[PDB]
Symmetry: C3
């Protein structure tokens, strides 16, 4: 947690919920994540690269999963910037994502559980 004030680019990997392997959900988020070290608060910002498909995202805060906040949304470029706090950048951050298939059919909804594994701030 010992980090000085400023803007740093923090890398991440999305791993499967109960497997130490890469999750297919990783491709919905732009790497690296932005890190603002302000007033001793670890704020992580990341571009959700498919606004239409990814409908909801929740990240663990104080022991429970809470819906992420939208910094700014770009409906023309099909992207959005999301903001969330992390308790520890050393523990695999459990996250649940709700998605929608672009198919022209009755069934299209989906949802998956995955873990965000953060490297070191730069």
């Amino acid at each position: 947690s010992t980090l000085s004030d400023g803007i740093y680019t923090i890398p991440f990997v999305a791993k499967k919920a109960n497997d130490d392997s890469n999750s297919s959900m990783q491709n919905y988020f732009n790497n690296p994540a932005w890190l603002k070290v302000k007033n001793g608060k670890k704020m992580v910002a990341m571009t959700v690269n498919d606004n239409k498909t990814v409908t909801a995202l929740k990240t663990t805060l104080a022991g429970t999963l809470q819906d992420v906040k939208v910094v700014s949304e770009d409906k023309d470029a099909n992207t959005r910037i999301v903001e969330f706090e992390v308790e520890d950048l050393n523990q695999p951050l459990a996250a649940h994502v709700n998605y929608e298939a672009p198919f022209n059919g009755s069934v299209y909804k989906g949802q998956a559980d995955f873990r965000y594994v953060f490297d070191t701030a730069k």
Copy 2:
């Protein structure tokens, strides 16, 4: 082929035409591909992440290469969703792509052959 009804995310890799190595053409397609298991028909959908550059794409169906169908096109975000049927998700699916360089010159056209190698549905 033994798969139940529903929406599943199928991963893929683009390999070189006559080499078991990754093809540079992989970066024109968004991973993973969407899979709709409806009425015993293996339908694969994928985002072509550069609408202007990638001009044509054909995938092998019943022994011959046929031009892929457009689900929906996004001219503002420079993307499009394409749909194609696969005979077997265990054989390397041969595909031919036609592309155009964004350079301001007389010569800009190009075309390449590659293989889609599908993993398992999720």
Copy 3:
């Protein structure tokens, strides 16, 4: 340097300034880069996939770093096509990038040094 006339797709990796490891800045540029072999001039074109964040980019030419030229800019899709000459496609091309965080705060600016390592034209 012995290459015939035409359009070829050249792959690249962004490595850390003083480390032979991948740079986080790699995700701001679309792979592969376009190569036009016209009148014995090695011209490299690449899509900067985040127009708003990446504010400036300079590539080494004749021993010094010079600001890259804009082929065409897409403000709707948040992209731009940049053009620059390379002295040798065998030496790690030193580059300096200026970036801006999308956070809603006083501090957001940043800048990093990295090297472009080019493979072979296709």
